[PDB]
Design a protein around this ligand. Structure first.
Ligand code: PC1
Ligand code: SF4
Ligand code: ZN
Lengths: 145, 148, 96, 95
């Protein structure tokens, strides 16, 4: 009996992911075919699912967006593509998703979560943030002598 | 005499004394010294049962705060602190622990000032606590129940 | 506000910008000079000055434990506004 | 990230114990990751009176080491009374 139901829900796996094409899309992209309730979505396109039935660690997950900040992320993705508001919910540091509890807004907070900028020409180059200490004599211009 | 609540024997410096003691007290220096007070300047200040003893002692502490010359630390800072504490006490804005805190502050003021004004400001607080702690406790309880 | 030096380098809030005849600028080509656009020097300026109706006022920075240590500012000089030394918020007596 | 009954019997028999009762995967028994705010208590010295640091001082009541002999019948003594032999564990003496 459970064999038949087990064979069956493997078809709900392909039905949930928008048919066969989406099934191979998620299989080749996120390496999983499991379905889950759409907890939310961010402005960059990442979709955020949760399934409390899964054991602690895989109860929440992301399908990363195809495109972010002028970069194709269909095939290459990383953990820095998580916006700061949702990084709390994803890492099980809270049970309140940004959809229900949104983080407090302030002027200085960014509006475009840049990913790891290492490698790309938008890297970070250390430099001294202080001015000079010893000044020079700046000799006069009149020949005089 | 039944309507007498308290007697200040010799001015603000001398601690007050309750009616039970006032029944039989000679007015010499030694007799009042045995009565945990002083003859001072023989300034009899009688307060009847219709007197807010907390209010009167707080007014005395306010006088001492206004008259402190501010030279030494215990009188400059301590007396003002006692004034604030007694101002809260009059409205009962405190808890039972600050009564002992005020006693400790008064003891810290005593014997640590250049002149005797620090002791003359600490003594009224000590007398008021020693003879009317239940009054402060009950006023504080009334304020607590009202602020509910 | 962040502005551009004659060479082209953006000056930070600390007034830092490499000189034209400075080789160190080599590090920034094919990269960018990481600077913070939100200047604290400006951002604190437009914060309204609170009309406190008392001689002195206590500032904790807002949020209690979330803010700075609570300090008391004396608002007695009518020619200036008392400014907290921790967060920069100003206060002023109601026209004295 | 649930096994069928047929599989559970195979796992249980191959191991000889009820694995479903005690699993190494945490499903829902864990504490909720969001918790109510706590109110921490105070120590034994959060008193408003009789709290002078002279009594509570720990560092200032450490005297210098006490010398018992310097270079500038009497029964033999021991650093301490001898250890007492340990006893077998009544819970599980022999493993
Ligand atoms: C001696 C010479 C012999 C030459 C033989 C001819 C073929 C040799 C090369 C075969 C592979 C060529 C590369 C193309 C496939 C590939 O590697 O894609 C990687 C790339 C890697 O993409 P990626 O880098 O984004 O993947 C990692 C990152 N994540 C996980 C986040 C996505 O994947 C694909 O192109 C997807 C292919 C999916 C289907 C793969 C085949 C499935 C069926 C296999 C059946 C058994 C075959 C045996
Ligand atoms: S105790 Fe006497 S000397 Fe000290 S501040 Fe008060 S008035 Fe001045
Ligand atoms: Zn401040």
């Amino acid at each position: 009996m459970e064999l038949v139901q087990v064979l069956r829900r493997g078809l709900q796996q392909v039905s949930g992911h928008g048919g066969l094409r989406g099934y191979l899309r998620v299989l080749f992209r996120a390496n999983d075919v499991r379905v889950g309730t759409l907890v939310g979505e961010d402005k960059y396109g990442n979709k955020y699912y949760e399934d409390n039935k899964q054991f602690f660690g895989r109860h929440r997950w992301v399908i990363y967006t195809t495109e972010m900040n002028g970069r194709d992320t269909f095939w290459d993705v990383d953990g820095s593509m998580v916006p700061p508001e949702w990084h709390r919910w994803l890492h099980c540091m809270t049970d309140d998703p940004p959809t229900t509890k949104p983080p407090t807004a302030r002027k200085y907070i960014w509006t475009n979560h840049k990913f790891n900028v290492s490698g790309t020409p938008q890297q970070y180059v250390p430099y001294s943030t202080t001015r000079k200490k010893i000044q020079e004599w700046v000799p006069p211009s009149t020949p005089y002598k | 005499w039944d309507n007498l609540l308290a007697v200040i024997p010799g001015g603000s410096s001398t601690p007050l004394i309750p009616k039970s003691v006032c029944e039989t007290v000679l007015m010499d220096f030694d007799a009042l010294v045995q009565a945990q007070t002083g003859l001072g300047t023989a300034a009899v200040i009688v307060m009847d049962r219709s007197t807010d003893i907390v209010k009167a002692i707080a007014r005395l502490i306010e006088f001492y705060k206004h008259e402190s010359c501010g030279q030494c630390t215990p009188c400059r800072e301590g007396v003002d602190w006692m004034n604030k504490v007694m101002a809260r006490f009059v409205k009962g804005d405190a808890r039972p622990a600050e009564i002992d805190s005020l006693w400790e502050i008064s003891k810290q003021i005593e014997g640590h000032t250049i002149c005797a004004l620090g002791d003359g400001a600490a003594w009224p607080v000590q007398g008021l606590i020693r003879h009317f702690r239940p009054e402060l406790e009950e006023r504080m309880q009334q304020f607590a129940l009202q602020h509910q | 506000g962040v502005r551009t030096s004659p060479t082209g380098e953006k000056v930070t809030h600390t007034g830092q910008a490499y000189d034209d005849g400075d080789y160190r600028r080599v590090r920034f080509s094919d990269r960018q000079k990481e600077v913070n656009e939100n200047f604290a020097i400006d951002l604190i300026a437009e914060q309204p000055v609170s009309e406190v109706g008392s001689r002195v006022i206590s500032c904790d920075g807002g949020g209690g434990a979330l803010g700075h240590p609570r300090v008391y500012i004396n608002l007695d000089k009518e020619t200036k506004t008392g400014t907290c030394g921790y967060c920069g918020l100003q206060f002023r007596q109601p026209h004295h | 990230a649930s096994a069928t009954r047929v599989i559970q019997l195979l796992r249980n028999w191959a191991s000889g114990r009820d694995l479903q009762a005690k699993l190494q995967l945490r499903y829902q028994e864990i504490s909720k990751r969001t918790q109510p705010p706590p109110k921490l208590p105070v120590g034994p010295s959060h008193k408003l009176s009789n709290n002078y640091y002279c009594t509570r001082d720990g560092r200032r009541e450490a005297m210098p080491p006490s010398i018992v002999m310097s270079s500038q019948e009497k029964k033999a003594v021991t650093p301490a009374p001898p250890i007492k032999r340990w006893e077998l564990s009544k819970d599980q003496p022999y493993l």
